[PDB]
């Protein structure tokens, strides 16, 4: 089990060697300069915010939502009635003798009924993701993934979304909650996340079971 | 799921400054707030006991 | 649902300045309030009781 | 997998100066909050007990 | 019961794109003005 | 059940490679915009 060959997280070298600096040229100066990559304009006082593909942004996930509904009716109803003659005059036997018209009844009628559901999600945490598309109207496509393998299992968090550049705080870094298309994932393998799946035989029965 | 429906007239005088009018000050003012799932069918009676709630001697 | 009807006649004079008047200054003032559905049926007396509270001798 | 949907129509000059407007200012709002997974089918009634909820006589 | 297909609350698409903006005027002016409306 | 392959939330690259920057015009200033959007 732990002598079956695996890949890493991290795959390839973990270090990188120094390369050897370029020839001086033979000017007369000290200064002297590696071939230069430009990276275009850059703004001097505005707040560093991502601008092109391959940017990186800084998301803060938090998120709290919570809903909940409930209801309920009910109808009772009871009526009891009754007449007794206990003593009949004589002119009255004929009428009312023999307990002719002595009755008693009884009813009732009861409902209860009552129903709600309720539903929340938490999630707090941060992840830096990158541009990897610009809009027309300059919104910037995000999309970001983190990997951390912890002794005896992977966990993937993924973040998918659109941002507005205005919404970017000057530290580089938005609330989830400002994303438009907000796509938020954590998941995991490993026994770990098998041990947390139900057994087929129980999900067949949750799904078809009578009650 | 849920529906609240509203409907009514309403005098524009009555509108506050931030858009708003208490349900009070409308006209006919329809009023409904219903659901549906079997949590709306668990607060529905049984056909046999409206029969005997509408037609029982007592 | 619930029904809540008002009719009568209303003096002018009588209407505040937010345009509101109370239900004791009107004239022929007509006040309803019904409903239907379980609940109201449940609040019906049976016919044969309500033919016993009618009729029986005591 | 939960989804949490939202649609309606805003008026321009209820929006904050933050861009952002209470959903009790939307118009048309349809608001929808639902899930899948076991957890989902966990709270769904069997359909033998949803067919006696609908259909038995008490 | 819950693989039964349903139709969503909030229907259709759930995002929109932005249309790219209309071509500015030759006219010597930076301020560019979408149709009015 | 755990085996079974799935599609996740987050389809497609999670990441993206920037693209090297236009070559600067020989005009005599060191200010070169990108095709302005």
New interface residues.
């Given amino acids: 089990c732990a002598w079956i060959p695996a890949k890493p997280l991290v795959q390839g070298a973990t270090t990188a060697q120094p390369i050897p600096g370029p020839v001086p040229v033979a000017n007369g100066s000290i200064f002297q300069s590696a071939q230069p990559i430009?990276?275009?304009?850059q703004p001097l006082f505005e707040d560093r915010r991502p601008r092109?593909?391959?940017?990186t942004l800084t998301i803060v996930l938090q998120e709290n939502?919570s809903?909940s509904?409930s209801?309920?009716?009910n109808?009772?109803?009871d009526?009891?009635?009754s007449?007794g003659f206990d003593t009949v005059p004589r002119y009255l036997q004929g009428l009312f003798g023999n307990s002719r018209?002595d009755?008693e009844?009884?009813?009732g009628?009861s409902?209860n009924?009552?129903?709600?559901?309720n539903?929340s999600?938490t999630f707090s945490g941060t992840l830096t993701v990158?541009?990897?598309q610009?809009?027309?109207?300059?919104?910037l496509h995000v999309?970001?993934?983190k990997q951390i393998a912890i002794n005896q299992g992977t966990e993937?968090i993924?973040?998918?979304g659109?941002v507005?550049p205005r919404?970017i705080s000057g530290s580089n870094s938005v609330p989830s909650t400002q994303v438009?298309?907000a796509?938020?994932?954590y998941?995991g393998?490993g026994y770990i996340?098998?041990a947390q799946?139900?057994?087929?035989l129980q999900?067949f029965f949750?799904?078809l079971?009578?009650?």
Avoid at 197 to 200: A, Q, R
């Fill in positions: 430009n990276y275009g304009y092109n593909i391959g940017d939502v809903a509904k209801s309920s009716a109808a009772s109803r009526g009891k009635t007449f018209a009755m009844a009884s009813g009628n409902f009924g009552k129903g709600g559901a539903a999600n990158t541009v990897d610009v809009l027309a109207n300059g919104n999309v970001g993934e993937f993924r973040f998918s659109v507005n919404t438009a298309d796509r938020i994932e998941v393998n996340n098998e799946n139900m057994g087929w999900r949750l799904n079971s009578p009650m």
